[PDB]
Amino acid sequence: ERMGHIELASPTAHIWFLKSLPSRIGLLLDMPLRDIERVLYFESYVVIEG
Amino acid sequence: LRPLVPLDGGRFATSDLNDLYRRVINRNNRLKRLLDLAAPDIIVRNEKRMLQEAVDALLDNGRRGRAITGSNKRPLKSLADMIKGKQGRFRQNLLGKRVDYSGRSVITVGPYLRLHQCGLPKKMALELFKPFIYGKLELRGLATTIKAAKKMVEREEAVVWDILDEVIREHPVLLNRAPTLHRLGIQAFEPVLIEGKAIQLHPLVCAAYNADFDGDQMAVHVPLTLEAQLEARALMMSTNNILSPANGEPIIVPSQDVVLGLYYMTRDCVNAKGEGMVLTGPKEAERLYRSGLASLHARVKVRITEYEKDANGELVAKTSLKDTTVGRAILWMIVPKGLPYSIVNQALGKKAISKMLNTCYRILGLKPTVIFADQIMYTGFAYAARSGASVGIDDMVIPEKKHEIISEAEAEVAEIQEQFQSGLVTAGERYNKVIDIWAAANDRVSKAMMDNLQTETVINRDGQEEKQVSFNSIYMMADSGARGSAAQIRQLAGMRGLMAKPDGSIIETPITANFREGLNVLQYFISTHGARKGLADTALKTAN
Amino acid sequence: VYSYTEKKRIRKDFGKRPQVLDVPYLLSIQLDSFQKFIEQDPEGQYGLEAAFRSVFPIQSYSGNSELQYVSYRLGEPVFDVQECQIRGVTYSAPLRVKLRLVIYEREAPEGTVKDIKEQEVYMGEIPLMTDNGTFVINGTERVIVSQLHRSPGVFFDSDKGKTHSSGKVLYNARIIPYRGSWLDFEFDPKDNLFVRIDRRRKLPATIILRALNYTTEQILDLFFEKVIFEIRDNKLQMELVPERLRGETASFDIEANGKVYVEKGRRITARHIRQLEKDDVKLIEVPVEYIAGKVVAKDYIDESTGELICAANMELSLDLLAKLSQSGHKRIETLFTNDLDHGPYISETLRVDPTNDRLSALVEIYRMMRPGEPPTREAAESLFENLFFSEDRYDLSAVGRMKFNRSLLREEIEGSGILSKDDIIDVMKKLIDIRNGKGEVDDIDHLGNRRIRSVGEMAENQFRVGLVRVERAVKERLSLGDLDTLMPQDMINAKPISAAVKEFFGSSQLSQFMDQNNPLSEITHKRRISALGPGGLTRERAGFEVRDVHPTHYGRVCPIETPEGPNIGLINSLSVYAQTNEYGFLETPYRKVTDGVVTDEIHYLSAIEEGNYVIAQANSNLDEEGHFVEDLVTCRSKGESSLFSRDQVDYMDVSTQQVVSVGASLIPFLEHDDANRALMGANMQRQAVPTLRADKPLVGTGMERAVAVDSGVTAVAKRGGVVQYVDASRIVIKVNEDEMYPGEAGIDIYNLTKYTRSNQNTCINQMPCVSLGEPVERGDVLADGPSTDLGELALGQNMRVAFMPWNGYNFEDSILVSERVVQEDRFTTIHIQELACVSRDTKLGPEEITADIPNVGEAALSKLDESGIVYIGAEVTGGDILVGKVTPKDSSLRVPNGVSGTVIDVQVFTRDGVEKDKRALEIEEMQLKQAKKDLSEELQILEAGLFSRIRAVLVAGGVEAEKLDKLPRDRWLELGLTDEEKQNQLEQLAEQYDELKHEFEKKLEAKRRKITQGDDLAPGVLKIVKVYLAVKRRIQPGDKMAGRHGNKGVISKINPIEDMPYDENGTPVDIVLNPLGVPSRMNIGQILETHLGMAAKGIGDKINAMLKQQQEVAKLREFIQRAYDLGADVRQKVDLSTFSDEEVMRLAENLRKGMPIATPVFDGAKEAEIKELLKLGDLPTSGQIRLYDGRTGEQFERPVTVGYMYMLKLNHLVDDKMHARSTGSYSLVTQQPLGGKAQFGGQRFGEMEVWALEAYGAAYTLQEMLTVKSDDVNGRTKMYKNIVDGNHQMEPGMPESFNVLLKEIRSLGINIELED
DNA sequence: CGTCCGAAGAGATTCAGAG
DNA sequence: CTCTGAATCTCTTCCTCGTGTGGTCAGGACG
RNA sequence: GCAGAGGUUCUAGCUACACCCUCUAUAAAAAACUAAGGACCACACGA
Ligand SMILES: NCc1c[nH]c2nc(N)[nH]c(=O)c12
Ligand SMILES: [Mg+2]
DSSP, X not given: OXXXXXXXXXXXXXXHHHSXXXXXXXXXXXXXXXXXXXXXXXXXXXXXXX | OXXXXXXXXXXXXXXXXXXXXXXXXXXXXXXXXHHHTTOOHHHHHHHHHHHHHHHHHHHSTTSSSOOOOOSSSOOOOOTGGGTSTTTSTTTSSSSSOBOSSEEEEEEEOOTTSOSSEEEEEHHHHHHHTHHHHHHHHHHHXXXXXXXXXXXXXXXXXXXXXXXXXXXXTTOOEEEEOSSOOSGGGEEEEEEEEESSSSEEOOGGGGTTTOOOTTTOEEXXXXXXXXXXXXXXXXXXXXXXOOBOSSSSSBSOOOOSHHHHHHHHHSOOOSSOSSOSOEEOOHHHHHHHHHHTSSOSSOEEEEEEEEEEOOSTTOOEEEEEEEEEEHHHHHHTTTSOSSSOSGGGSSOOOSHHHXXXXXHHHHHSOHHHHHHHHHHHHHHHHHHXXXXXXXXXXXXXXXXXXXXXXXXXXXXXXXXXXXXXXXTSSOHHHHHHHHHHHHHHHHHHHHHHHHHHHHSOOEEEOSSSEEEOOOOOHHHHHHXXXXXXXXXXXXXXXXXXXXXXXXXXOBOSSOBXXXXXXXXXXXXXXXXXXXXXXXXXXXXXXXXX | OOOTTTTTSOOEEOOOSOOSSOOOOTTHHHHHHHHHHHSOOTTOOSSSHHHHHHTOOOBOTTSSEEEEEEEEEEOOOSSOHHHHHHHTOOOEEEEEEEEEEEEBOTTOSSSOBSOOOOEEEEXXXXXXXXXXXXXXXXSSEEEEOEEEEEOSEEEEEOOOSSGGGSOOOOOEEEEEOSSSOOEEEEEOTTSXXXXXXXXXXXXXXXXXXXXXXXXXXXXXXXXXXXXXXXXXXXXXXXEOOXXXXXXXXXXXXXXXXXXXXXXXXXXOOHHHHHHHHHHOOSEEOOOTTTTTTOBBSSOEEOSSSOOEEEOTTOBOOHHHHHHHHHHTOOEEEEOOOOTTTSOOHHHHHHHHOOOOSHHHHHHHHHHHHSTTSOOOHHHHHHHHHHHHHOTTTOOOOHHHHHHHHHHTTOSOSOOOSSOOHHHHHHHHHHHHHHHHTSXXXXXXXXXXXXEEEOHHHHHHHHHHHHHHHHHHHHHHHHHHSOXXXXXHHHHOOSHHHHHHHHHHHHSSTTEEEOOOSSHHHHHHHHHEEESOSTTSOOTTTOOHHHHSOOGGGTTTBOSSOOOOSTTTTTEEEBBSSOEEOSSSOEEEEEEEESSSSEEEEEEEEETTHHHHSOEEOXXXXXXXSSOOSSSEEEEESSSOEEEEETTTOOEEOSOTTSSSBHHHHTSTTTTTSOTTHXXXXXXXXXXXOOOSSOOOOSEEOSOHHHHHHHSTTSEEOSSOEEEEEEOSSEEEEEEXXXXXXXXXXXXXXXXXXXXXXXXXXXXXXXXXXXXXXXXXXXXXXXXXXTTBSSSSBOOSEEEEEEEOOOTTSSOSSOEEEEHXXXXXXXXXXXXXXXXXXXXXXXXXXXXXXXXXXXXXXXXXXXXXXSSSOBOTXXXXXXXXXXXXXXXXXXXXXXXXXXXXXXXXXXXXXXXXXXXXXXXXXXHHHHHHHHHHHHHHHHHHHHXXXXXXXXXXXXXXXXXXXXXXXXXXXXXXXXXXXXXXXXXXXHHHHHHHHHHHHHHHHHHHHHXXXXXXXXXXXXXXXXXXXXEEEEEEEOOOTTOBEEESSSOOOBEXXXXXXXXXXXXXXXXXXXXXXXXXXXXXXXXXXXXXXXXHHHHHHHHHHHHHHHHHSXXXXXXXXXXXHHHXXXXXXXXXXXXXXXXXXXXXXXXXXXXXXXXXXXXXXXXOOOHHHHHHHHHHTTSOSSSEEOOBOSSSOOBOSSOEEEEEEEEEEBSOOSTTTOOOBXXXXXXXXXXXXXXXXXXXXXXXXXXXXXXXXXXXXXXXXXXXXXXXXXXXXXTHXXXXXXXXTTOOOOOOXXXXXXXXXXXXXXXXXXXXXXXX
16 A cells, blocks of 8 residues: 655656657647757757846 | 565576666766766766667667667566557456456356256365355364364365255356457356266257357356346346347347257158048147157147137137148147247248247247247257258259259350361450350259259048158258259259359369269369458458 | 288278379378488588588688688487487487688689588487488477478569559569579559569569660660651651551551551551551651650760760650751651550650669669768678679579570570579560450469478578678688688587477477377378468468469369368368479479370479370270270360360370368368368367277278378388287287398388377377287288277278257257267377476575475375385375475475376486486386397397307208307307308307407497486476376266268267167167258268268178077178179279188188268269169168167157267367356456466456446446455455455455556656546 | 566548649 | 549557466676 | 463464454463465367
């Protein structure tokens, strides 16, 4: 009945929302899923607060 | 919830989920160590990638494109795989829960049973109904503790059986087949204790179940609560399910042996022993047949009292001398009062019996219908056993004109081939003409076969011989409707027909040999084509 | 003339057609395949030598070191078949490979080596094949079924239909290799050729051509024609050819040399074409309108500067034509485009082509194959080159090369294994031609395009994989390793190559468990061919088309025998005459017809070669000279039965049963029943559990003497002779002198396997059938096995069957069984199980087997011996103790609930370094006494032959036999025997004996050493004890009992004998079937079979009556002679005048219980012959008798059919089906029913049953079946207490599985709660 | 002893070419 | 010239129970 | 187990939902009370 939690050192995205039929986080930011896939796996840079 | 307790030879290591969790924890710890150690940015980013991949695998393994594995190179079961699919805890453990108080065995006929009961092996019942036995043993004072009652049960003492005969009196059980498509699949039944090892099923209810006796297996569940026992009596008992939910047609229909017995019972012979006698009543008809002074089917004159319910709730008696056979007069006793006499004066095939049952259900209530069905089944079984209806090689009569028809058809085929050679007709035209003439030959062969089987018997009617409906066993099994249509009779005496090629093209040369005679190698191959096609179609028809 | 085996019970044969070819050894496909995997092949072709030569250059990269393979030699198995089966090890032969390591001088390719290192290295152990064809893997028997997979090579397909939803045909072509990636050319709906390698994304086909260093001009001239236009003042007159003109209409006035043939816009009629060829003019006047829409074929640069005026494959516009005309380009080559015949497919692909040269094509290919990687010139070149041209990656096998050359219509057969440029361009050209219209697709289902991969090929492939892995290892090891120091043994390990072989033989989709349910079951499993497995169709993937039977399965694959169910048609059975070709395709024998005579020479014909030839049918009457009497003989030319003449047919079938398999041929009167009931009856002869007393089939096909002998169920004599000492466990045969080898010979001991466990828990017993003095000849079966009578397959019993409905007890398929069946123990089968107990080292010390179990009664320990094992002979039941395992602080194995029987034997396996227990010591003691007893007996009868040989020859020579006998006969060296050709051998033997006794003593010590040594066990275990239980199940209501034809059905009621129907003579029937199953299910064979069985039993009873009253042998001789003939030109023609008085007597005793009758499948007995057979006795000729009734005693009118049908009990018994559990141990989810019978379980109330309950008003029973019955920790105990108290109430609660689901979803990062 | 080490359709997409 | 209808590209699903057999995994030093 | 302690037996037996008895320093006189580990994959077969 009781559970435990693991404190992740770095934030990690939920695959069920990132990679689904409508790509929830992709739809929210109006960004193509490919760019989000690239930046999420440490490939490319998205420049927040331009 | 993640067990890791196989305990086989001390292995103590079977958790797919636990491995993934350890992977995630190890990656997180290494990332923390690198972060506090101020490692180069590239190494920290690589460890971050590893952590993200581990979390992805933990949540839904195989969604990114790769699958974490290693156990004989088989993908690991993540949390997402434990919810979806046909094996997750949503269609395997939440909808279709396995139940206790259940059993399983093979089926057997047991015609002695009534409609509302069924057989149940003693050794199966003594384990299905163990808690009730414990309770009644404690109540009657035979045992004191649950351990003493347990020992008394395992010893299988004589008192235990007497107790079991009390907790089984009015305790319905839910016999259930495996592919229960419609609601009639699981039906309630009162238990009748037998000494075998198979649950006996009433022959009439072997149609609603789609039940079969080639080794089919059923499951026996036991209702426990008072509401369950009342419901498995007022909602699911076999007596209350007469009409199918989809179409308003009876679901208890005499299928094979009883219909043959009734057909053999209710026929006529142009000259049999005991013809023209004026019988007193059905009792006298039964006495005369049993003694042997007369035969089952012989036209006589017997007075019969027909009760009609034309008056509202009043049964008016009409006694008259109706002209009918001995066999029909004997069957009149089974028929209840309300129904008229014209129902049991015909040949009484299969549709006739179904219509008789339906008319009984309409005019009378449901209560007499069950008894009528049971009596019909008993009488049909008895007078089918007395008949000795058997199939022999001499019964399959080959029409005499078959060789002439085949020779003429071959002559027509040769003529069409000659026209094709001369260029008068094309290849497709030749093919179509050959198919048409072979089909015509097949029709003629089938017609000749039927004409030589349906009315072949000629019997001496106290003088010049008179044609009569034949008594051929194959014809009796086909006309009544017991088992086998006209096409299957054709395949046994007439030509098989034009068999088809796998793609669908009809082969020019038809199988001109019946099953009674020899079948050539090529003809058997052509038949194998269609047989394999049919079996393969059914194999996936089921799943679809 | 018949052998002594056939002179005991000669089977009456009804076959009418003479045979030319005898049935081949059934297990030849497996045995020969494995033979070509270990036999030393000098040329180095198929086998192990081939693989070794393939992957053993072993030259370190510039490492001046080479390792060469010179020879291999298989070892000798440590343990034989019996020892491997008993102990539990693999029947294996160690592989000893002799290698050589030569150390070249430092960077001296032109120099020699300093020294060689020729030495032998052990390289894994390969399992061996037992003579029958079974593999002993881990103490069990495993059989590797052959695989039928699509042959390597090119295969043009159509793939017409669903695509494009417009009916457009998407022609494709796949080059399937034996090892590599599939090159796939595919046409686009817009007519664009698209290469699709390894079934990856689509690429334009021009890219592959560009990647082969082909320029645009090269491709254009390769895949197109050329129309040449010449610069002339006469409106740019061009050369023309009449042949190209045919097909399309002319759009201009065709004229030449001032002679107009065709007009402008005039369709070129046939007469116009003919007069055009007659004219034969090369240059025809053309206007500029015709050349307006023309595609050029080559680039044209200007002459003034050099820049390109127009590029290749460019549409020449009017301005372009003017510019090139004024530039001075006399030759104008434009590609021909016949829209009807030669489509512009390549040009359009070039238009879609995005690359320009080889570099761009290679970069694109690298990008496609390896996404996310930077395209490097060298890297791209390497990937493309290896993928389509390297010997290491791409390997088109010899079969693949042959198929490729045949499909491309080439001439040579042997090519190479690397796809060349010409091969690719030719495949593309043929695909284009098919798209044009010339050519046809190739049917994949054709048996000429599917090949059989038996055991040998798969083992070779797995060994090759292991060898390339070890080569990868040694390649890296050799370079950096020090030279001239280490031996070849160091650089090669055994584990990485043994792992592959062991994994393939032990755990694979084709290493199926053998099912020794019957002598027929073993034969069918070995010969089965299955599509499923590596490189084969999965059950879900397979479509309806694969499951069908192709017209070319005739004689190659059984059309009847196919497992019904999911994999229907995917696993078919090999025919009875099929034999694999050299490449791997299937073949079928045929007889050659030269002019009009059927020559006896048989030529095996492949699937492809069968098409052109016209083959006749077996059922064609001959004339004792070879000429067909009928002028018109039925034939089968190209999948189309027809009627040809005797002057056209050139091939004929060999036998009438060559179409059916082994199982389907055993069915008598198969020519009468449907192709569905035969299918369902052929799968029912492989599940017949062997009975107690074997009973021969009264009526059989004639192949009953082949399945028995060919299978290993029976012990066949290896050398002819006279039986010396026959016992219930051993038979010793003294061979004849001619067969006897010159030295150390005389006796051939055969040991029979007594009651032993089978793979499906049955009994395997071998009963002797010969007697002391009977002359045994080579090939004579001297000991039957399970389900075998006098060397004749006997799977069931023949019972008296009467077809009639009996009070409804024989309903839809039920069968009535008289108590005479049970009383005589006709179907009582023996079943043997094997319970085991393992003692392992444990925490706080190891467990022990001592009978010191705590808290148990003396009665519990009464079965246990002082050591702790149950006596052999005790009748243990459920709950009793079997062993005495004591664990450090009562875990002794107990008989599982339900299991009963008697203990037949006990084995105690121990590990090396642990002292044997007293009981082990007592089995080991008996085994060593009996092992010693066996050596002593062998020595004694060896001296019976040897000292007798020392005798037979001692008497010849003049030396007194009494004088020789006075001194020790063995050492007669003192009395010098007269020298002869056998005296030298005898003196040598006596010298050997003053020495062989010492050697035999060492051999006895070595034989005893194997028994004494502890067997290697699993790490951590001390000793294991296996106890075998044997039960005797009888017939019970519910046990399925089916026939051969296909009639099935469970036994309904064991009716007493007095109540069963009895005929006039008083003998009651034993089975009362339901006649209503024959008219619909057209298995009309089971009636004929009944009539023939009745006739056979009638003749048997007449012979018995002649025997009961002592009668002269002449009467028996004449009556048996009459029965054996019966006219109808029967093939057998047996003569009794060649027999002896005792021989005829023996035959009379053996036939007193019915005369066995043979009936070949498709040429069996006709109705008239059966009627004559019945009239030969006294039975009615119709086949139906007046059967009275038991209960009433009245007469059944309409007489019924009575006969003798062969009924065999299926192994789907009822004792293994009943399972009722009120309560049991819960699962991890806490659901109480684990399921199954082994662990008390509850039947699953599936969704379907839940819906069925919901359809009714059922609501309370649903709750009580979902919560309080399955999983409610606070509900189940409450309801149990309520039930044992009296009130049947219920507390709903909430299922534990729902809480498990809630926790699983909550652990997913999704918050789900039960709101109130 | 821990401790570290085919198919069949649907969605989910682009590509597009004409009016 | 920008979104028509027309391809193009990944994604999910494929009866329902028994009777059984066999094979079964993470990662071995280490301080 | 009134609370603490011990307990006949009919594995083990103040919790698993538990339950009862006698006794006052520690075990011994007595009957009535209840059901414990099951991870995955291939192959075969039946309706
Ligand atoms: N579970 C409690 C228990 C252990 N021993 C017992 N002995 C007896 N007489 N009574 C009991 O209640 C107990
Ligand atoms: Mg059935």
